[PDB]
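User:
I would dearly like some help making sense of a protein record. Take your time, and here it is.
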Amino acid sequence: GAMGNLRLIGVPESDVENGTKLENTLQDIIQENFPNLARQANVQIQEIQRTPQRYSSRRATPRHIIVRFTKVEMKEKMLRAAREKGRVTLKGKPIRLTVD
């Protein structure tokens, strides 16, 4: 629930996901949905991870991804843009960005 965190909801899990792929996923989301942010290239995402760190035998749904921004203002800008845009996509499939 940190001020600089958002949750990325609905990204399918993958057995071959790694840190590089997660960084690329966030950049793909920005480029697919938020062209002014993409052009400016000043989203300073600091850490990106699935939560929790393990996928349990009880879990039924893909884990959220927590994205921690360097700037709280930028977290909030992305959240506001997502909410106003409505449908936000990753390879044409809907995802959600929400507060942590």
About this structure: The chain has one domain: 1-100.
